[PDB]
Design a protein around this ligand. Structure first.
Ligand SMILES: *C(=C)C1=C(C)[C@@H](Cc2[nH]c(/C=C3N=C(/C=C4\NC(=O)[C@H](C)[C@H]4[C@@H](*)C)C(C)=C\3CCC(=O)O)c(CCC(=O)O)c2C)NC1=O
Ligand SMILES: *[C@@H](C)[C@H]1/C(=C/C2=NC(=C\c3[nH]c(C[C@H]4NC(=O)C(C=C)=C4C)c(C)c3CCC(=O)O)/C(CCC(=O)O)=C2C)NC(=O)[C@@H]1C
Ligand SMILES: *[C@@H](C)[C@H]1/C(=C/C2=NC(=C\c3[nH]c(C[C@H]4NC(=O)C(C=C)=C4C)c(C)c3CCC(=O)O)/C(CCC(=O)O)=C2C)NC(=O)[C@@H]1C
Ligand SMILES: *[C@@H](C)[C@H]1/C(=C/C2=NC(=C\c3[nH]c(C[C@H]4NC(=O)C(C=C)=C4C)c(C)c3CCC(=O)O)/C(CCC(=O)O)=C2C)NC(=O)[C@@H]1C
Ligand SMILES: *[C@H](C)[C@H]1/C(=C/C2=NC(=C\c3[nH]c(C[C@H]4NC(=O)C(C=C)=C4C)c(C)c3CCC(=O)O)/C(CCC(=O)O)=C2C)NC(=O)[C@@H]1C
Ligand SMILES: C=CC1=C(C)[C@@H](Cc2[nH]c(/C=C3N=C(/C=C4\NC(=O)[C@H](C)[C@H]4CC)C(C)=C\3CCC(=O)O)c(CCC(=O)O)c2C)NC1=O
Lengths: 177, 81, 177
């Protein structure tokens, strides 16, 4: 199971991996606190489109110049590209949470991102705000403390996993600062 | 000036090589001539991998752990407005 | 059958040509170790975009003066152009490996390239380093000894084909030195 997931990322082939009950028990035996880790991942990816749109909208209401003419969210093409990058970043942070390891986020998403954004004229300070809203969102879903949506879980404490997503979102800002 | 060797009619054109291979009867090999198109960002984001991210899909219901499944893929993505 | 491949390049018409069945059996009969040759070509073209980008960036990180003001990779126009040249050279080398014949690469790509570089001010020393990185990449994929990705092949020895791509890359540096 782990080798197939690794080969999907290594190949970049866009073909989905799929797993049985004995396979899932092998990956859960490799992972730390898989039961709580898989519910934490599920809490983010069940809300990911709502998360990205709300975060990008928040970056804009705090900095309206982004959507004025010459603004880096001006025209529908740029707005859609900005929502594409918000989703990319959120997806890679989710796989770092599933893996218990920053390496995939660092190596495939964050390496070269600062230089690419500087070359494109993408505002890094505004990018950091959008990411910071996604951090607050993810901590709320993992702890089931979101104000407008509740999710269903077995009772217990998930504070370590919340501290875990915080550290991965903080790596993004640290890379692009 | 470079117009001696690379004329603007033929400039930046290079062969392409294609495989229709699956270990199947109708498998083929293909060639075409083509204009090479690329942009400055590619050093870190090559066109083979660019704009891909990990979709993760999980299926569960309370106490139904015998039915549970997780899936991973990385297609190209378009953020919804 | 290789004359049909050459016909395309002779015409430069951008219309595709395909071989299978008896025509592909004639190609594999005509060109030495075709079965292993086609897998060797497939190993390069499956990785070609990542190869070029890593090599081109590999020449810049070792020589950061290339991306300083007045450097020959400075501004996005020059950077897109360099990355483009990388794909153009790898293209003709992959086709020279398919043919088992360096003459396409020499006649259509390397002929006049030194004088072109000198007239443009493109640094030939740094160009040789980008080519030398692609040489190492191609040798690794053909022998399936790359540390970053494994592909699937029938067991055997491919040393001749690796030593074959070696010389073809070496011809690029020999032309532009
Ligand atoms: C601009 C006027 C502006 C915004 C737009 C908005 C952006 C923003 N969002 C948060 C925090 C959260 N947003 C959440 C998103 C959602 N909640 C849901 O229940 C659904 C599924 C989803 C899509 C609508 C969540 C979960 C949070 C955190 C928990 C909560 O309920 O509050 C913030 C605050 C971040 C911070 O602390 O800085 C911001 C800024 N706010 C604006 O002002
Ligand atoms: C923090 C994330 C949450 C929280 C989570 C808890 N979940 C607990 C148990 C539990 N969860 C699942 C589903 C999960 N495991 C899988 O294998 C898959 C899919 C492949 C998923 C989505 C299961 C099966 C279980 C076992 C109990 C059950 O539901 O029948 C749990 C208890 C401890 C543990 O089992 O590790 C907790 C704390 N709870 C919270 O209150 C926050 C919000
Ligand atoms: C994209 C990731 C490809 C891929 C490429 C490979 N690169 C390989 C080797 C290699 N690349 C560089 C450039 C690199 N080194 C530097 O110091 C700098 C700047 C900081 C850069 C960007 C070099 C120098 C080398 C080593 C060449 C040498 O001198 O021998 C390589 C082969 C590695 C190996 O042998 O295991 C590959 C295949 N690899 C992939 O899997 C994807 C598709
Ligand atoms: C060195 C380059 C490689 C390696 C290559 C080998 N390939 C071998 C056999 C083989 N490969 C293919 C696929 C190829 N032929 C086609 O017709 C097409 C496309 C249409 C492709 C991509 C075939 C069909 C075969 C023949 C056997 C089969 O049916 O699978 C092979 C074994 C040769 C032998 O028969 O002794 C080798 C060595 N192997 C390596 O280990 C490196 C990485
Ligand atoms: C939104 C939060 C930002 C914003 C973002 C923009 N990004 C633009 C282009 C762009 N972004 C990337 C990086 C992306 N591609 C990847 O492959 C990965 C990771 C694997 C990531 C994170 C790339 C490569 C590109 C250029 C290529 C392309 O767009 O496909 C962009 C458009 C720039 C332009 O018009 O040229 C925007 C608007 N903009 C904002 O205002 C906030 C801060
Ligand atoms: C058929 C074969 C074939 C080729 C091999 C290329 C050769 C080639 N490259 C460039 C053009 C260029 N080539 C480079 C290349 C580089 N700059 C660097 O600093 C690096 C060392 C190197 C990449 C590794 C750059 C940056 C330009 C742009 C030059 C310019 O704009 O003046 C041009 C001229 C285009 C122009 O500037 O108008 C040509 C003909 N094209 C072809 O048609």
């Amino acid at each position: 199971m782990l080798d197939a997931f690794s080969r999907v990322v290594v190949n970049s082939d866009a073909k989905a991996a799929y797993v049985g009950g004995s396979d899932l028990q092998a990956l859960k035996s490799f992972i730390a606190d898989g039961n709580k880790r898989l519910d934490a991942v599920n809490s983010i990816v069940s809300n990911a489109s709502c998360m990205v749109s709300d975060a990008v909208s928040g970056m804009i209401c705090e900095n309206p110049g982004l959507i004025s003419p010459g603004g880096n969210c001006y025209t529908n093409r740029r707005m859609a590209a900005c929502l594409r990058d918000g989703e990319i970043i959120l997806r890679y942070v989710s796989y770092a949470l599933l893996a218990g390891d920053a390496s995939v986020l660092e190596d495939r998403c964050l390496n070269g991102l600062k230089e690419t954004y500087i070359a494109l004229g993408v505002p890094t300070n505004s990018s950091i705000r959008a990411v910071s809203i996604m951090k607050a969102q993810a901590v709320a879903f993992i702890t089931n403390t979101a104000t407008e949506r509740k999710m269903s879980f077995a009772a217990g404490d998930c504070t370590s996993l919340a501290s875990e997503v915080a550290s991965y979102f903080d790596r993004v800002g640290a890379a692009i600062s | 000036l470079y117009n001696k060797y690379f004329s603007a009619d033929r400039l930046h054109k290079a062969p392409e090589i294609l495989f229709e291979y699956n270990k199947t009867k109708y498998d083929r090999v293909g060639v075409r001539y083509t204009e090479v198109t690329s942009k400055a960002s590619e050093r870190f984001f090559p066109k083979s991998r660019m704009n891909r991210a990990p979709v993760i899909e999980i299926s569960y219901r309370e106490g139904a752990v015998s039915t549970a499944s997780v899936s991973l893929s990385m297609p190209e993505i378009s953020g919804p407005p």
